[PDB]
Amino acid sequence: MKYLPQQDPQVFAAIEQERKRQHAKIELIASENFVSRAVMEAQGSVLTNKYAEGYPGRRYYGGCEYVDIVEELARERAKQLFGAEHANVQPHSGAQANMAVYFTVLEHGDTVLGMNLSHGGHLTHGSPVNFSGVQYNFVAYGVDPETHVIDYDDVREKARLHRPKLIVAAASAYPRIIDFAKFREIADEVGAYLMVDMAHIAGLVAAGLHPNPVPYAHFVTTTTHKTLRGPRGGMILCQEQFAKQIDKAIFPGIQGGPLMHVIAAKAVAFGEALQDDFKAYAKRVVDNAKRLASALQNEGFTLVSGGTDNHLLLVDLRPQQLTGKTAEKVLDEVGITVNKNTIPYDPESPGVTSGIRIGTAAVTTRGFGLEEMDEIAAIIGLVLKNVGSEQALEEARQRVAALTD
Ligand X SMILES: Cc1ncc(COP(=O)(O)O)c(CN[C@H](C(=O)O)[C@H](C)O)c1O
Q: Which residues are designated catalytic?
A: 51, 53, 197, 223, 226, 232
Report whether 158 contacts 143 (CB < 8 A): no
Report d(CA 260, CA 43) in Å as an integer: 9
Report whether 273 contacts 224 (CB < 8 A): no
CB of 91 to ligand X, least distance (A): 8
Nearer to a second copy, 297 or 337 (CB): 337
Nearest CA among 205, 207, 244 for reference residue 221: 205
Footprint on residues 105-164 left by a second copy (CB under 8 A): 108, 123-124, 127, 129-131, 135
Nearer to ligand X, 260 or 393 (CB): 260
Residues 6+ apart with CB under 8 A from 156: 186, 189
106 binds, among ligand X, a second copy, none (CB under 5 to 8 A by kind): none
Q: Which stretch binds a second copy (CB under 8 A): 33-41, 186-194, 212-220, 391-399?
A: 33-41
Footprint on residues 249-278 left by a second copy (CB under 8 A): 252-257, 259, 261, 264, 267-268, 271-272
The two most distant CA atoms of the chain are separated, in Å, by: 65
Does 32 help bind a second copy (rule: CB under 8 A)?
A: yes
Instruction: Please work out, in degrees rounded to the nearest 5, the angle formed at the alpha carbon of residue 174 by the alpha carbons of 140 and 120.
Output: 35
Report d(CA 44, CA 266) in Å as an integer: 13
Report whether 304 contacts 175 (CB < 8 A): yes
Does 404 help bind a second copy (rule: CB under 8 A)?
A: no
Nearer to a second copy, 94 or 120 (CB): 94
Nearer to ligand X, 61 or 66 (CB): 61
Cα–Cα distances in Å, from 32 out to 40, 54, 105, 233? 15, 30, 30, 13
Footprint on residues 9-28 left by a second copy (CB under 8 A): 10-11, 14-15, 17-19, 21-22, 25, 27
CB of 273 to a second copy, least distance (A): 12
Footprint on residues 159-218 left by a second copy (CB under 8 A): none
Residue nearest ligand X by beta-carbon distance: 94
Binding residues (CB under 6 A) for ligand X: these are 31, 51, 53, 93-95, 122-124, 170, 172, 197, 199-200, 223, 234, 255-257
CB of 205 to a second copy, least distance (A): 20
58 binds, among ligand X, a second copy, none (CB under 5 to 8 A by kind): none
Nearest CA among 210, 223, 153 for reference residue 180: 210
Centre a 10 Å sphere on the Cβ of residue 135 and count the other Cβ atoms it contains. 18
Nearest CA among 175, 197, 141 for reference residue 316: 175
CB of 175 to ligand X, least distance (A): 13
195-220: buried (b, 16+ CB within 10 Å) or exposed (e) per residue?
bbbbbbbbbbbbbebbbbbbebbbbb
Nearer to ligand X, 12 or 131 (CB): 131
Cis peptide before 350 (omega within 30 of 0): no
Which of 101, 140, 282, 338 contacts a second copy by CB under 8 A?
A: 338
152 binds, among a second copy, ligand X, none (CB under 5 to 8 A by kind): none
Nearer to ligand X, 199 or 264 (CB): 199
Centre a 10 Å sphere on the Cβ of residue 403 and count the other Cβ atoms it contains. 17
Task: For the chain, state the CA radius of gyration.
Answer: 21
* CB-based burial label for 374 (10 Å; 0-12, 13-18, 19+): middle
H or E, element range at 108: none
Nearer to a second copy, 298 or 349 (CB): 349
CB of 40 to ligand X, least distance (A): 17
Report d(CA 353, CA 174) in Å as an integer: 16
2 binds, among a second copy, ligand X, none (CB under 5 to 8 A by kind): a second copy
87 binds, among ligand X, a second copy, none (CB under 5 to 8 A by kind): none
CB of 309 to a second copy, least distance (A): 23
197 binds, among ligand X, a second copy, none (CB under 5 to 8 A by kind): ligand X
Nearer to ligand X, 346 or 381 (CB): 346
Does 401 help bind a second copy (rule: CB under 8 A)?
A: no
